[PDB]
Amino acid sequence: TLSHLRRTNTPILAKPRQLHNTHWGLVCPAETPEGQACGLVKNL
Amino acid sequence: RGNLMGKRVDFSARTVISGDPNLELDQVGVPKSIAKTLTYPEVVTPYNIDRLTQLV
Amino acid sequence: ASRHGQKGTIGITYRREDMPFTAEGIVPDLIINPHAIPSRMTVAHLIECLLSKVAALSGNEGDASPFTDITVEGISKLLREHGYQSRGFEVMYNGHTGKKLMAQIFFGPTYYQRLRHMVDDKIHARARGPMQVLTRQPVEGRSRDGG
Amino acid sequence: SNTLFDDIFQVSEVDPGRYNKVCRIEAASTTQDQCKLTLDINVELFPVAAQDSLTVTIASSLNTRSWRPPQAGDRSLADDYDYVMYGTAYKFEEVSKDLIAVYYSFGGLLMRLEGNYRNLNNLKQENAYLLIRR
Amino acid sequence: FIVEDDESLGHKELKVRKGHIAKLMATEYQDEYTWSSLLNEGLVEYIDAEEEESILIAMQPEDLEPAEADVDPAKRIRVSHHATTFTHCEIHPSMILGVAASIIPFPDHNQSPRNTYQSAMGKQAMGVFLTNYNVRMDTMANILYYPQKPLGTTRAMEYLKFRELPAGQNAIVAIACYSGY
Amino acid sequence: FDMGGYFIINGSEKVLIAQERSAGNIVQVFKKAAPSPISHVAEIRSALE
Amino acid sequence: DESAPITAEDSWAVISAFFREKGLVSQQLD
Amino acid sequence: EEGPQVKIREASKDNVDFILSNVDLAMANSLRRVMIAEIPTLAIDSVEVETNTTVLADEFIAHRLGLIPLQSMDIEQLEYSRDCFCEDHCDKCSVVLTLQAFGESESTTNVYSKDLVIVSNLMGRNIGHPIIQDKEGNGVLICKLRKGQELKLTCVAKKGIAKEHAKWGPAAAIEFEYDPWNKLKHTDYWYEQDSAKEWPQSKNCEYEDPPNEGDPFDYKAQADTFYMNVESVGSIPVDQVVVRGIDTLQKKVASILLALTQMDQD
Amino acid sequence: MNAPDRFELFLLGEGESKLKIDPDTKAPNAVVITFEKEDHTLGNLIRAELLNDRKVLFAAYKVEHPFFARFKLRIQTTEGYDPKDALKNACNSIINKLGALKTNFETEWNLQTL
Amino acid sequence: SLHKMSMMAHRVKVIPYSTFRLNLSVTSPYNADFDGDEMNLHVPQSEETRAELSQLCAVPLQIVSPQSNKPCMGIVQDTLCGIRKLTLRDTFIELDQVLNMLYWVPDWDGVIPTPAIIKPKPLWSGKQILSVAIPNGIHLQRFDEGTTLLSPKDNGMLIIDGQIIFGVVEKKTVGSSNGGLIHVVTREKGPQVCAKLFGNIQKVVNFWLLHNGFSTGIGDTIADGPTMREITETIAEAKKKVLDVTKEAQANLLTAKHGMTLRESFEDNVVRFLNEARDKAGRLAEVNLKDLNNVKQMVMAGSKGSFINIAQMSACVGQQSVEGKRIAFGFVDRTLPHFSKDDYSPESKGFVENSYLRGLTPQEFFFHAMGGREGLIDTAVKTAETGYIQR
Amino acid sequence: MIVPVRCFSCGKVVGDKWESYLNLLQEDELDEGTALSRLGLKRYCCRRMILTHVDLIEKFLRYNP
RNA sequence: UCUCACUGGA
Ligand SMILES: [Mg+2]
Ligand SMILES: [Zn+2]
Ligand SMILES: [Zn+2]
């Protein structure tokens, strides 16, 4: 429930699914569900 | 593409899998309660009329 | 599932006379595959078992804060001072012959997770249930016994 | 059903490379000079270091079918050497016109035996025993 | 943190100090010196990525500030300081994990897609979900009959209230083939 | 041990996801590709907040 | 001496006062 | 004597420890297996609840009720409710328990083992006493409740062994280890440099001698000199469980002979 | 649903012979007997005392599958010897050693403190 | 569903405890696993339908695979490492266990074999009691490197009719291999003899594993002390090499060969020297380790893992990556604020120094989190595009 | 919750030990390896039950009749 | 009574 609260959406072979170096310390660098929502939905 | 080249069927069974090596290569372990509901309509045959009437 | 991606299912079950046992007379509850480890390299699982053993024996609790300076040599000295093998090994016994197994056993406790996806929640079997109206096909969905 | 061939050897090197129980050995030929034996021996029951004297005998006989337990009251056997092993020859590789080397397997073990006057002795027989004392 | 050298000890040092931490320890004992008081004291600095464009942090303040005027063989390797002008300081880099991904005992050794699998799975863990469970009228609650705190205690579980409300169990595990299952 | 952060809409505990986008009102320049007469294009989103 | 250079274990208390000042739905409440 | 000699060392009320020498390997193994699994025991099986407003579930509380161990000295004269030819339970195949615990003291009203009262006529049998092994004489921590809450039961306890369940196992972690100084080569220890220094000098090394390093390898010896440490819950004392276990093992081998007499006549 | 009658590991249903005995087609005087509702305990015990004799040449047990509770044992004795008599000598050696064990252990229970 | 073998047929053996079984060496070509992955069940309906499925679509008819003319099945992880430990020469067996396994084979001839060691005592080099499983009329020969009939390694093979003459049993015999023993069995006899081969080898190695055991643990991960010291000084000399070529880049005197500029001609040299040092240190670790290294035993089995896997778990993790490149600055001039600006040290460009044993400094942890999330990107796009290209 | 009756591996009861161990901690505050050595769980796989087990029963029973 | 939306698993 807590991770569901601190979760982030984004609408639209490309760069935004990556783990950019600006996410360091802000985005959880190891959380995203599988499937087509991989790489995009993020958590803090 | 949904109803003409392969559809949802009858006489179907879907579950989880598990392993065992004590079975053999041409063997699959079906649950007993599927066996109580998966069935086969075989014709009345004199070759095992006793066993088929015993089943019914 | 475990806590590091070694998820799996309950293969088959025994009771304790069939289940193995050790030189202090304890049994494990859940044994895993030794080939499940060295591909995915989840060394976290081994270190969790080992430090959990040291902590749950000595009474204190293992520092699971991640970027600390805990060494396997540290857990080793603290385990050998209790008196098992320094890397954590043991000797278990077979449940049928009771023979000393020629190799050893690595042993320890670990927090395990029950998650969802039960066997009575993935089972599905249809032998001529009711049909549709438009296509009159076999229906879909478990709660009306779809194909 | 007789003793096929007997021989007398010294030992130069036993080689326990990579191995706890099985160990290869090399024969020092304190005989006629032709005979040479390399042999995997099981040193778990047969503690053998260098420079022993070994009387190696082929002995395909005890004067097929199941094997009964060896019934420690009495048996008909030539067993009273130290070392009774069982196996199979496969191929007698031609190093001919001066020697014939023989190559045997004991269910998982290796025998190479050299020399030349046994040009009539051995065979590709299924059983081919081994009997060593000392 | 803020690590300007505003003290005459020589080289650069912290501005946060142990007496402020001890006043915070009195604030622990209250359970007057809040994090707002820490802000108004001028000790911690709210930084975004845009302000992170032009800084140079130090990670461990009990490592990275002084110079070397012996080593543990079974320990990890920290790199160097190829600089001197550090401006801010990491609180503890074990905060950069998420809610679910910090429940991991020892993520210092994995292969990181396994951690991703942990973040996927650990959501689905089932046990205690809340405390008012006999009062609520919600669908698909999965109460464990016997909860258990884990053996691994990362201190993020403490403020995370995981060690107060868990959702699993321990068991004993061995790792050897037993009967081919 | 509830901490909240969630509404109640008709009894449902619906929870708003923090959304994510890029504003204008900041310098934006691109490198547009071959199907164009543009080699580089600057942009604002002149969106009145 | 109150002016000591710190260890990381002080920062755990810093986070302690931080979280038990705010909570965890901080941006929702903000 | 002739065969299995028993040389009992340190013992207690609930600890046995004994050199069981000149016995066979699978004999020892079969003995520890039958004493784990194959001993009948009274414990609570059927549960009928009248009313409950406690914080725990009826099924959860009934599961604890089943896990309560009672006194099982007199197991031999209690029938199975399957082989008893009555109407589903009687006073020779079943043990009825009745428990009503109400709370009004307004600070953590408790419920423990010693609240159980055997309302069923026990016919003068040493059965059904809830085993207060407690130092302070309370029992297992059963339930916690307040004013309006209430604990109302009607339970029936029956027989059975540790193979139906774990609730009919009084066995509790029975050990077995022979031959520490391994002359039998049944196990080579994992080692980097030296197993004698790396692997620890084990516990039962006092009685059999250190294996006299300079000897060649013995092959003849079988499994001898076993040191089996046993334990119990306390439903029966630790001698009577070994008694009833060897008795049931002897009875099942007599059942093999029963089947042989079934065979060779018909 | 699929958890069976759990008492099938030791007890029966309707009409099971607790043994089933048959000859074998490989060697002279070989007999396979299956035993129902037992386990590796009884199996290893019977096979361990059956190992000792010189009047037997082969005897071996196994279980088929740990779902069901039945397990087999095959014995080839020597010529003329009844393999069921090999069984009888072995199991009364079993009752011999069990009774001698019960005597020795009860005596050392009584002849010791508490 | 992806190939001819993606569906098959097997006989029914009704059980309790509702799962679907399968034998553990038909779970390889199905590409399933025991994580709860799901399989369906279609029951054929007419008499001739049953005849068609039973006479074609059963597994022993499918065994040799048309995919790349090899066998698609074989022997997998636990059975495989067990048969790898078993056919070692040391595996001496007692009497009654030979009796027990020979009943365990479901088609024993009732022949107690002659013990290869009878010196006083009846023993067996367990390759021979494996040979009673292998049926008649076989030959194979491999001659791996210097296997000329006097192998000092027992690597290779030789079979006659179901008598293993010498050699271990591993993946390149009992698995999916080109000169597969299963392949030779199917060609020389046929499918039902192959189907019984699988049952024999499976249950024989099953019983031997149940009463021997095979484990692994951190003792299989930790190398010896001075060799871990050699590993760390080897990576130190690797950083000496990258330090010299960086200081040669500072002087800008770098002879860029044609194909790339000076910077990328420097980059390929850094990456090549780095990974060459990685695999040299991995070989140093792998020849450090001894026979009782269980994960090394699983490597020579070929069940899971690789020399790269033991190299990662002991010597060094190596080099993270994103999209073919090493780590490039999402910021300007640096990958992380803990780093200086304009760093072409490998430590900012994405080298990781220690293996999983000693741990992860958080910069390395972030690099590795990128290197794994890249792989999750590639599965979450390639399932879609390979599914369209398939259909 | 409650400490489980018959700590799962061994099955020796330890749910008797909880109130005495509670007053042993609140009354004497030792190291719990010694405290459980006083309440006598010699094997660590059963020492884990008392070292681990979390009660939530009091936070349950705060609520309401 | 199902259409669509969004989650969930592989
Ligand atoms: Mg899957
Ligand atoms: Zn009755
Ligand atoms: Zn326990």
C141 CA vs L5 C1’ separation (Å): 18
Q: Is K60 annotated as ligand-binding?
A: no
Distance between CA atoms of residues J248 and H261, nearest Å: 96
Token reading at I105: 């252990």
Residue type, C63: D
Cα separations in angstroms, J336 against E91, E98, H75, H165? 16, 19, 73, 58
**E181 and chain B in contact, CB less than 8 A:** yes
Q: Which residues contact E42 (CB under 8 A, 6 or more apart)?
A: E2, E15
* I1/C96 touch (CB, cutoff 8 Å), yes or no: no
Q: Does residue J35 approach strand L to less than 7 Å at its CB?
A: yes
- Burial label for H37, CB within 10 Å (0-12, 13-18, 19+), is buried
What is the residue whose two structure tokens read 């049994």?
Answer: C27
Q: Are C70 and C51 in contact (CB under 8 A)?
A: yes
Q: Are B13 and J40 in contact (CB under 8 A)?
A: yes
What would the 3-class secondary structure string for chain H be? CCCCEEEECCCCCCCEEEEEECCCHHHHHHHHHHHHHCCCCCEEEEEEEEEECCCCCHHHHHHHHHHCCCCECCHHHCCCCCCCCCCCCCCCCCEEEEEEEECCCCCCEEEEHHHCECCCCCCCCCECCCCCCCCCCCCCEEEEECCCCEEEEEEEEECCCCCCCCCCCCCCCCCCEECCCCCCCCCCCCCCCCHHHHCCCCHHHHCCCCCCCCCCCCCCCCCCCEEEEECCCCCCCHHHHHHHHHHHHHHHHHHHHHHHHHHHHC
Q: Are J166 and J156 in contact (CB under 8 A)?
A: yes
Distance between CA atoms of residues H97 and J5, nearest Å: 61
SS3 K5: coil
Q: Are J275 and J214 in contact (CB under 8 A)?
A: no
H-run or E-run covering C51: helix C43-58
Token reading at D21: 């129980």
Best to test chain J binding among E108, E110, E124, E179 (most J CBs inside 10 Å): E108
> Which residue in J323, J359, J329 sits closest to J342, CA to CA?
J329
Alpha-carbon gap: A12 to the closest alpha carbon of chain F (Å):
10
Size of interface A-G (CB pairs under 8 A): 6
Q: Which nucleotide's C1' is closest to A41 (Cα)?
A: L7
Distance between CA atoms of residues J19 and J30, nearest Å: 17
Best to test chain J binding among D24, D48, D67 (most J CBs inside 10 Å): D67
Q: Are E157 and E167 in contact (CB under 8 A)?
A: no
With the CA atoms of B11, B15, B19 and B25 taken in that order, what torsion angle do they form, in degrees rounded to the nearest 10?
A: 10
Distance between CA atoms of residues E12 and E88, nearest Å: 11
CATH superfamily of the J63-215 domain: RNA polymerase Rpb1, domain 3 (1.10.274.100)
**Strand pairing category for B27-28 and J11-12:** parallel
H-run or E-run covering F29: strand F28-29
CATH number, residue K62: 1.10.10.60
Token reading at J377: 């990107």
**I88 and chain H in contact, CB less than 8 A:** yes
Render J300-354 in DSSP notation, one character per residue: HHTSS--HHHHHHHHT--EE--BTTB----SSSS-S-TTS-SS--SHHHHTEE-S
- What's the helix, strand, coil split of chain J in %, to 5? 45, 10, 45
Q: Which residues contact I19 (CB under 8 A, 6 or more apart)?
A: H259, H262, H263, I33, I34, I35, I36
Q: Which residues contact H229 (CB under 8 A, 6 or more apart)?
A: C25, H15, H16, H17, H174, H175, H176
Q: Are C91 and C105 in contact (CB under 8 A)?
A: yes
Distance between CA atoms of residues D30 and D56, nearest Å: 13
Rg (CA), chain I: 18
Closest CB to B3 among C119, C128, C137: C137
Closest CB to I57 among D69, D72, D73: D69
Q: Are I21 and H263 in contact (CB under 8 A)?
A: yes
H-run or E-run covering J390: helix J362-390
Distance between CA atoms of residues J304 and H47, nearest Å: 51
> Which residue in H225, H244, H248 sits closest to H236, CA to CA?
H244
Helix (H), strand (E) counts: chain C: 3, 6
Distance between CA atoms of residues K38 and H171, nearest Å: 23
* Other beta carbons less than 10 A from residue F18's beta carbon: 13
> Which residue in J339, J20, J76, J317 sits closest to J206, CA to CA?
J76
Distance between CA atoms of residues J125 and E88, nearest Å: 68
Render J152-163 in DSSP notation, one character per residue: SS--S--EESS-
Q: How far is the CA of H165 from the centre of ligand 2 (A)?
A: 21
H-run or E-run covering I85: helix I83-110
For chain F, the straight-line distance linking the first and the last C-alpha, in angstroms and rounded, comes to: 38
Q: Are D108 and J167 in contact (CB under 8 A)?
A: no
Distance between CA atoms of residues J331 and H147, nearest Å: 65
Closest CB to K51 among C25, C28, C56: C56
- Burial label for E119, CB within 10 Å (0-12, 13-18, 19+), is buried
Distance between CA atoms of residues J367 and J326, nearest Å: 10
Q: D1-134 maps to which CATH number?
A: 2.40.50.140
Cα separations in angstroms, E12 against A39, E85, E88? 40, 8, 11
Q: Which residues contact B43 (CB under 8 A, 6 or more apart)?
A: none
Comparing every residue's Cα with the C1' atom of nucleotide L9, the nearest one is C117
> Which residue in B4, B29, B8, B33 sits closest to B19, CA to CA?
B29
> Which residue in H155, H131, H127, H154 sits closest to H40, CA to CA?
H127
* Other beta carbons less than 10 A from residue D70's beta carbon: 17
Query: Sign of the CA dihedral H239, H240, H241, H244?
Result: positive
Specify which residues J39 forms β-bridges with: B15
Distance between CA atoms of residues D35 and J116, nearest Å: 24
Q: Are J134 and J116 in contact (CB under 8 A)?
A: no
Main-chain dihedrals φ then ψ at residue J16, nearest 5 degrees:
-85, -170
Range of the domain at E64: 1-98
Cα separations in angstroms, J65 against J29, J78, J198? 10, 23, 16
Q: Does residue A35 approach strand L to less than 7 Å at its CB?
A: yes
**Strand pairing category for D130-133 and C21-22:** unpaired
Residue K34: its chain C contacts at CB < 8 A? 59
> Which residue in J100, H2, D67, H263 sits closest to I46, CA to CA?
J100
Question: Which ligand is closest to the CA of H46, given by its number?
Answer: 2
Token reading at H207: 């009685």
> Which residue in D85, D77, D75, D76 sits closest to D54, CA to CA?
D85
For residues I35-74, one letter each, b for 16 or more C-beta atoms within 10 angstroms of the residue's C-beta and e for the rest, the string is: bbbbbbbbbbbbbbbbbebeebbbbbbbbeebeebbbbbb
Distance between CA atoms of residues K28 and K34, nearest Å: 11
In chain J the beta strands, taken as DSSP E runs, fall at: 11-12, 39-42, 117-118, 122-123, 139-140, 159-160, 214-215, 318-319, 351-352
Chains that touch E (3 or more CB pairs under 8 A): A, B, C, F, G, H, J, K
Distance between CA atoms of residues D2 and D125, nearest Å: 14
* Other beta carbons less than 10 A from residue I83's beta carbon: 22
Main-chain dihedrals φ then ψ at residue H18, nearest 5 degrees:
-155, 130
The CATH class of the J216-361 domain is mainly alpha
Alpha-carbon gap: H214 to the closest alpha carbon of chain D (Å):
12
Specify which residues C108 forms β-bridges with: E173
Token reading at H209: 């001698």
> Which residue in J139, J167, J162 sits closest to J151, CA to CA?
J167
Q: What is the resolution of this structure in A?
A: 4.4
Best to test chain A binding among E51, E102, E116 (most A CBs inside 10 Å): E116
Alpha-carbon gap: E175 to the closest alpha carbon of chain B (Å):
18
**Which nucleotides of chain L have an atom under 7 angstroms from any protein CB?**
1-2, 7-10
- The correct answer on CATH 2.40.40.20 for the domain covering J1-62 is yes
Render chain D in DSSP notation, one character per residue: -----EEEEEEEEEE-TT-SSEEEEEEE--SSTT--EEEEEETTSS---TT-EEEEE--------------TT-------SSEEE--EEEE----TTT---EEEE-SS-EEEE--SS-TTT----S---EEEE-
Cα separations in angstroms, J82 against E181, J171, J297? 13, 11, 10
Query: Sign of the CA dihedral E90, E92, E98, E104?
Result: positive
Q: Which residues contact J87 (CB under 8 A, 6 or more apart)?
A: D108, J126, J127, J130, J164, J167, J168, J169
Best to test chain E binding among C24, C31, C72 (most E CBs inside 10 Å): C31
For residues J103-117, one letter each, b for 16 or more C-beta atoms within 10 angstroms of the residue's C-beta and e for the rest, the string is: bbbeebebebbbbbb
For chain I, the straight-line distance linking the first and the last C-alpha, in angstroms and rounded, comes to: 50
Domains and CATH numbers, chain I: 1-114 (3.30.1360.10)
Token reading at J189: 């006899």
- Burial label for F25, CB within 10 Å (0-12, 13-18, 19+), is exposed
Residue J16: its chain I contacts at CB < 8 A? 2-4, 67
Q: Which residues contact C43 (CB under 8 A, 6 or more apart)?
A: E109, E110, J218, J221, J313, J356, J357
In I2-98 the beta strands, taken as DSSP E runs, fall at: 19-23, 30-36, 56-63, 70-77
Residue B19: its chain E contacts at CB < 8 A? 180-181
Closest CB to I58 among J17, J99, J109: J99
Cα separations in angstroms, H150 against D5, D100, E88, H54, J151? 94, 96, 60, 6, 80
Closest CB to G14 among E65, E91, E155: E91
> Which residue in I71, I72, I84 sits closest to I29, CA to CA?
I84
* Number of folded domains that form chain K: 1
Distance between CA atoms of residues G14 and G2, nearest Å: 16
Q: Does residue C7 approach strand L to less than 7 Å at its CB?
A: yes
Distance between CA atoms of residues B49 and J159, nearest Å: 51
**A37 and chain E in contact, CB less than 8 A:** no
Q: Which residues contact E58 (CB under 8 A, 6 or more apart)?
A: E3, E64, E65, E81, E86, E88, E89, E90, J338
Q: Are J286 and J296 in contact (CB under 8 A)?
A: yes
Range of the domain at K49: 1-65
Cα separations in angstroms, A40 against A30, E22, J335, J363? 12, 42, 21, 22
- Length of chain A (residues): 44
Main-chain dihedrals φ then ψ at residue E83, nearest 5 degrees:
-175, 175
Alpha-carbon gap: I2 to the closest alpha carbon of chain B (Å):
7
Q: Which nucleotide's C1' is closest to J32 (Cα)?
A: L10
Q: Which nucleotide's C1' is closest to J37 (Cα)?
A: L10
**D66 and chain I in contact, CB less than 8 A:** yes
Main-chain dihedrals φ then ψ at residue E57, nearest 5 degrees:
-75, 165
Q: How far is the CA of K10 from the centre of ligand 3 (A)?
A: 4
**B33 and chain I in contact, CB less than 8 A:** yes
Q: Does residue C8 approach strand L to less than 7 Å at its CB?
A: no
**Strand pairing category for C30-32 and E169-177:** parallel
With an 8 Å Cβ cutoff, the interface of chain B facing chain J consists of 9, 11-35, 38, 40-42
Distance between CA atoms of residues H17 and H229, nearest Å: 5
**Strand pairing category for J11-12 and I56-63:** unpaired
Query: Cβ within 7 Å of strand L: which of C 74-133?
Result: 117, 130, 132-133
Residue D20: its chain H contacts at CB < 8 A? 188
Chains that touch I (3 or more CB pairs under 8 A): B, C, D, H, J
Orientation angle between helical segments J191-210 and J181-188, nearest 10 degrees: 140
H-run or E-run covering C89: strand C89-90
DSSP state of E32: -
Q: Which residues contact E122 (CB under 8 A, 6 or more apart)?
A: C3, C113, E100, E101, E103
Distance between CA atoms of residues C20 and H33, nearest Å: 11
Residue type, I88: K
Q: How far is the CA of G2 from the centre of ligand 2 (A)?
A: 78
D25 CA vs L3 C1’ separation (Å): 83
Q: Which residues contact J368 (CB under 8 A, 6 or more apart)?
A: E111, E112, J317, J320, J352, J360
